[PDB]
């Protein structure tokens, strides 16, 4: 098995599916190419995911003392966080429901040989 | 020049004309402006034809320019430096550089500037 380190961003105020759309672009890629892809990705959900990946890479480099050049984004996914309920008043007196969803993003980077 | 194939820029023809005039004024006053890519794409022929009018500097051409620019300081600069500067260049007074997209609405931004090589 390979050495690894993980980071987690909980209660990120983005919907889970929108975060997954961005996440599906950086599965199995190295940390640097994933960071560039998220930097040039035209989605607002890319900033939190890039922050999580950078935090995981820093955790791997610092606490375990792993070489950042060998880091690879092995496991990454976004779950569902607590959602808050709002009300949008509508025509003819009816009230509809609005869901303000959040998400948790988990990233596991690991050191792989060149 | 060639009219826009599709709907106008600012949402109406008059607003589009005012927008082009203001953009040309800003470009001549500063030397380079940053705006959405279609705006610069439409601004290129307008500014280049104004510069062409300024190149052959006569009272008739001055009136022709002033009927679109409306700003007298910019007109004076256009007919004093910008005009004579491009005296021996035949076309291609401006250039368009594509830059990073806007953050609020992901609009494609571009920078349009006058050439200063020669």
């Amino acid at each position: 098995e390979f050495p690894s380190a993980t980071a987690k961003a909980r209660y990120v105020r983005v919907s889970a599916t929108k975060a997954r759309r961005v996440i599906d672009l950086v599965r199995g890629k190295s940390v640097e190419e994933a960071l560039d892809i998220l930097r040039w990705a035209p989605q607002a959900a890319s900033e939190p995911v890039a922050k999580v990946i950078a935090s995981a890479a820093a955790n791997a480099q610092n606490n375990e003392g792993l070489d950042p050049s060998t880091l690879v984004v092995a496991t990454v996914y976004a779950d569902e966080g607590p959602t808050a309920k709002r009300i949008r008043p509508r025509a003819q007196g009816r009230a509809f429901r609005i869901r303000k969803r959040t998400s948790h993003i988990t990233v596991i980077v690991e050191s792989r040989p060149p | 020049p060639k009219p826009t194939k599709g709907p106008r820029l600012g949402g109406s023809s008059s607003h589009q004309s005012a927008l082009l005039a203001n953009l040309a004024t800003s470009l001549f006053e500063h030397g380079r402006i940053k705006t959405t890519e279609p705006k610069a794409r439409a601004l290129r022929p307008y500014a280049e034809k104004l510069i062409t009018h300024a190149k052959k500097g006569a009272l008739h051409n001055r009136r022709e320019v002033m009927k679109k620019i409306r700003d007298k300081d910019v007109v004076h600069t256009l007919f004093a430096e910008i005009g004579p500067f491009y005296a021996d260049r035949n076309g291609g007074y401006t250039r368009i550089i594509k830059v990073e997209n806007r953050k609020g609405d992901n609009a494609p931004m571009a920078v349009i500037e006058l050439v200063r090589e020669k």
Binding site: W40, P42 | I97, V99
Partner: protein, 54 residues
């Protein structure tokens, strides 16, 4: 018109799979010495230093 029936998992997932984002293509650039990735659309802008590069 309103849906007459609840969509099954298979159809929902199959149609949902088409909502995705494409990865932009990146080429290298040399600015201030260090090499970094920039989309080819912004190559000239990066070379003239018009793009903020963190």
């Amino acid at each position: 018109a309103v849906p007459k029936r609840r969509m099954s998992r298979a159809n929902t997932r199959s149609r949902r799979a088409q909502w995705k984002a494409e990865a932009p293509g990146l080429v290298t650039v040399s600015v201030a010495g260090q090499q970094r990735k920039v989309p080819r659309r912004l190559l000239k802008a990066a070379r003239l230093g018009l793009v903020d590069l963190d």
